[PDB]
Structure 1
């Protein structure tokens, strides 16, 4: 459970170690993902000092026939197998219609190379969800040691209605406006051949491991307490469902999850998601990631 620093990304480092994906949104959201040059010119990405900001356009009223709201999706150039990734996050996007995520995948063969969602949610609805999506023959036991609560236990995209196998974090400040009011926190994910684990520590936690908070060169996960989400190999050969994955951090709007009427209105958001996203630019002023660092250990 001992790992050593492999990548340390802070500030402007993200501009050379990640790319921006200017792609049609695979989740069909009301978004226009821009390239790196466009994002930097429009200040949708800001990467300087000890800060990376990734944000949505919060000024344009969209043309209903035109593209969706400008935003960004960044992807690590490097890929990882057995590793730990630690995200020191000061702020995550909020607002009705938002669907932010920090996750890992191999886009080239999805879902067969796996995806693991470390931070994800929709429409300001706490708590955070940590979820795997795989091909066939991957499920999770009903009971396993973790602080969060399992919802769906079948990870196979094809037989699970694309829900994946997910765990809900136990505290509201794991996500959304609650997380932002508290100054964010740290998310760490350990992936091995035998399991995936995710830990959340709030910014003000008296028990955050120094491993996580101070980002030294060596870490030991045996000292981190019980994970928030645990995906053991009891009913899933983890290593055979995941290959080398990139880290992705993005913000979409509406789309296949957040944009469902039942879900959007369920969250207390008014009207249709697309109409809201088109017509309320100001409401996205807080639709930004503010990331202090991302570090990977191997």
Structure 2
């Protein structure tokens, strides 16, 4: 479980090693995903020094008949199979209606190339969820060694209500306003032929592996303790359900998950998600990622 540095992305490096996906939102959110040039001009992406900011427009009041709220979805140019990805995240988007994610997939053959969601949630609702979405014949055992709590254990999007097989992180500060109040933290995901693991370490953790915290060129996941989420191959050939995946980091609003009235209102968010997103630009001033680095090891 020893790996060596493959990519080191800090600040302006993201502008040449990722693209912006100016696409209709696959999750049907109240979002307008802008291109890279537009993002940089409007300061929705800011990539300089040791900082990457990816943010929502927090100034425009939207025409209800016009496009959704400007935001960004960035995708690594490179693809990865067996690897470790480490995200040093100072801030993640918050606010009613927000649906941020840091994840990997192969968009071109989804879901057959797999999807792993590393950071994901909606409407400020902690804790973080870590989830696989696959094609047929991929499930997880009811009990396996991890610190998080399994929810759905069938990863097949065709037969699991499109939920994937998920794990909830054990602490509130894994996600949302709680995470942001704490200065964020580190997410690491190891993928091999035999498993996927995710670890979360809060910013203030006394037990964060130096491997993760300082980003040296050599790491050893054997020394990282029990993962937060564990997806073993007991009932899923992991390698046959995943192919070469890009890393994606995005922020959408409302849409198929966050926008459901019961879910949005259940989070303490008033009224209509789309109406809220249209008419409360200032409420998205804290709907930003602040990323110190993303590093991949192979």
TM-score interval for Structure 1 and Structure 2 normalised by the shorter chain: over 0.9
Distance 1:272 1:165 in 2: 29
Distance 1:138 1:272 in 2: 36
Residues 1:148 and 2:167 aligned together: no
Structure 1 residue matching 2:88: 3-state secondary structure: strand
Distance 1:276 1:161 in 2: 27
Distance 2:265 2:152 in 1: 22
Q: Deviations over 1:106-151 (max 9, x none)?
A: 0000000000000000000000000000000000000000000000
Q: Deviations over 1:162-219 (max 9, x none)?
A: 0000000000000000000000000000000000000000000000000000000100
Distance 1:240 1:128 in 2: 26
Matched residue, 2:210: 210
* Cα drift, residue 87 of structure 1: 0.1
Cα RMSD, aligned residues only: 0.2
* Cα drift, residue 52 of structure 1: 0.1
Distance 2:157 2:259 in 1: 19
Distance 1:286 1:277 in 2: 13
Q: Deviations over 1:229-283 (max 9, x none)?
A: 0000000000000000000000000000000011000101000100000000000
Distance 1:177 1:118 in 2: 17
Runs of 4+ in 1 over 4 A off after TM superposition: none
Structure 1 residue matching 2:119: 3-state secondary structure: strand
* Cα drift, residue 291 of structure 1: 0.1
Distance 1:165 1:264 in 2: 22
TM-score normalised to structure 1 length: 1.00
TM-score normalised to structure 2 length: 1.00
Distance 1:188 1:142 in 2: 23
